[PDB]
Design a protein around this ligand. Structure first.
Ligand SMILES: CC(C)(COP(=O)(O)OP(=O)(O)OC[C@H]1O[C@@H](n2cnc3c(N)ncnc32)[C@H](O)[C@@H]1OP(=O)(O)O)[C@@H](O)C(=O)NCCC(=O)NCCS
Ligand SMILES: CC(C)(COP(=O)(O)OP(=O)(O)OC[C@H]1O[C@@H](n2cnc3c(N)ncnc32)[C@H](O)[C@@H]1OP(=O)(O)O)[C@@H](O)C(=O)NCCC(=O)NCCS
Lengths: 179, 180
C-alpha cells in the first residue's frame, strides 16, 4: 500500500489521525485531542502511516523509553472498515525494522482492558496473578491476541490501572537475534 | 524533620533537588536536571519533599498515567547519607495518602536492574518468565526489595529494556480497600 514515514507537517493528515483517535478511544482523546497528536510528532518518536491515495487508514508510533534500546509501541490504530486486512501487521512489521535500525532491542506496549474483553478483567488480579495471566482467554476480540500472533508475549499486568478490575496488559518482544 | 508538599515556589529547594538527582543519576540527570525538576513541578504530577531544618533530604514524585486511577511513582530519592533511616518509607506513605485523596487507586513503578542486582537480570526472561519473577532473589541490595517491604508487588518485567539482560522491573500496589 503506501505505508511510510508520517508527514508531521501535514495539518490534514494530523486532523485525520486526531479523528481516528477520537473515534477509537473517545474516553482518552477529547477536545484537546490535537495536543495528543502533537506529542506523537516529537522528534524522538517514530511516526508511520498507511495512507490510501489521501485517506489515512492506519497509524503506528513508537516512543524510545529506555535509552534507544527499549521502545514503547504507542499508539496503533486502523480505520474500522479496513481491519482484518493485514494493515496492522504491516504497520507493526514496518515499525520493528525501523526501531531495530535505530538501536532498539525490545518493543513493549500496554493494551488496556476496560471492556471486560479478556479474563484478566473483572477479577482481583492480586489473587493468583500469574495463574490468571497464563490462563488468559479472549472474550471480545481484545487486541492482545493480535500482538501474540505477531510474536509479542504478555510479560506483565497492572492491576486496577483504569479503575477496579480494569487492568493494563504489558506485552513485549525482542526484535533482533541475540548476538 | 517533616514530610509535606514540595513548595515549588522555592528556588533553593528546586536547586537542592536538581543536585540530589545529579548526584544519584548523573547519566539520567544533568543537562535537563535543572529542567526535569520542573517537569516534576507540573501541577498534574505530585511532588513531595522530606525536609530537615531546611535541607531537602528526600523527594518523591508521581505522574497520573491512567485517568485518575493509576499513578506512576517517579522519582524516589533519599540523600545517600540519610538512607536506611526510614525517610523513603515515610515518603511513600505520604505519596499514597496524596494519591488516594485525588481519587487514585493504584501506584506502580519501574525499577531497573542494570548491574545484576537481582536474579531477573542475566537470564532469558521470555523463558519461565513468571516462575523467575516469583522466585526473585536480591543479590546486591537492589531497591525492588525496598518496595516489596512497603507492600508493592512485582507484577511484570520488560526483557532487555536497557540492553541485553538488563530489564526494567514493574511493581504495583493498590492503595485503598478493595470494594466488597
Ligand atoms: C488491533 C488492530 C490494530 C489490528 O489491525 P488489523 O489490520 O485489523 O489486524 P491484521 O489484519 O494485521 O491481523 C493479523 C492477525 O491477527 C488477528 N487479529 C486482529 N485483530 C484482532 C483482535 N482484535 N482480536 C483477535 N485477533 C485479532 C487477525 O485475525 C489475524 O490473524 P491470522 O493471522 O490468524 O489470520 C486493529 O483491529 C485496530 O485498529 N483496532 C482498534 C484499536 C486497537 O485496539 N488498537 C490496538 C492498540 S493496543
Ligand atoms: C531505595 C531508597 C529510596 C529507600 O529509602 P530508605 O529511606 O533508605 O529506605 P528505608 O529506610 O525506608 O527502608 C525501609 C525498609 O526497606 C529496606 N531497604 C531499603 N533499601 C533497600 C535496598 N536497596 N535493598 C533491600 N532492602 C532495602 C530497609 O532495610 C528497611 O527494611 P527493614 O525494616 O527490614 O530494615 C534509597 O535507598 C535510595 O534513595 N536509593 C537510591 C535511589 C533508588 O534506587 N531509588 C529507587 C527508584 S527505582
Amino acid at each position: 500500500m503506501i505505508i511510510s514515514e508520517f508527514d508531521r507537517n501535514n495539518p490534514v493528515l494530523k486532523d485525520q489521525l486526531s479523528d481516528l483517535l477520537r473515534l477509537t478511544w473517545p474516553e482518552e482523546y477529547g477536545d484537546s485531542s490535537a495536543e495528543e497528536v502533537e506529542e506523537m510528532m516529537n522528534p524522538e518518536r517514530i511516526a508511520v502511516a498507511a495512507v490510501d491515495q489521501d485517506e489515512l487508514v492506519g497509524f503506528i508510533g513508537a516512543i524510545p523509553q529506555y535509552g534507544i534500546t527499549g521502545w514503547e509501541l504507542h499508539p496503533l490504530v486502523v480505520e474500522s472498515s479496513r481491519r482484518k486486512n493485514q494493515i496492522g501487521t504491516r504497520l507493526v512489521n514496518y515499525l520493528e525494522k525501523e526501531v531495530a535500525s535505530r538501536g532498539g532491542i525490545t518493543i513493549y506496549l500496554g493494551t488496556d482492558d476496560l471492556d471486560h474483553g479478556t479474563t484478566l478483567s473483572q477479577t482481583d488480579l492480586y489473587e493468583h496473578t500469574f495463574d490468571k495471566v497464563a490462563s488468559i482467554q479472549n472474550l471480545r476480540e481484545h487486541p492482545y491476541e493480535f500482538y501474540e500472533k505477531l510474536g509479542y508475549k504478555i510479560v506483565g499486568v497492572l492491576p486496577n490501572a483504569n479503575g477496579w478490575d480494569k487492568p493494563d496488559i504489558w506485552m513485549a518482544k525482542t526484535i533482533i537475534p541475540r548476538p
